[PDB]
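P.,

For your records, the input lines for the assembly:
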Amino acid sequence: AMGDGEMLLIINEYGSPLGLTALPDKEHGGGLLVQHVEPGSRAERGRLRRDDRILEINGIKLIGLTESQVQEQLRRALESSELRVRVLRG
Amino acid sequence: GSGVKDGVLHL
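Structure tokens returned:
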């Protein structure tokens, strides 16, 4: 849909950080706000940037989910070989 | 996993 942001692909390395720091987006309707992306990381290579708002991970929409549900869906997604992440740019 | 610190997530 028009207005739905950009779909990014991050390759998952099992057991290794992807290089993302995020926090719940309290003020803007939900999702995760990217605070930092580590240089050279898998998240950086997948074109994640500071102030991205992550709306969806591997097809699971984050808006409307509780904070605990979002954490659970992250854990689930991190069992898979890659993360398909839909973002709105800052 | 749990890189979770007062709502902030490290992934």
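Two observations worth noting. The radius of gyration of chain B is 6 Å. Chain B is about 0% helix and 45% strand.

Regards
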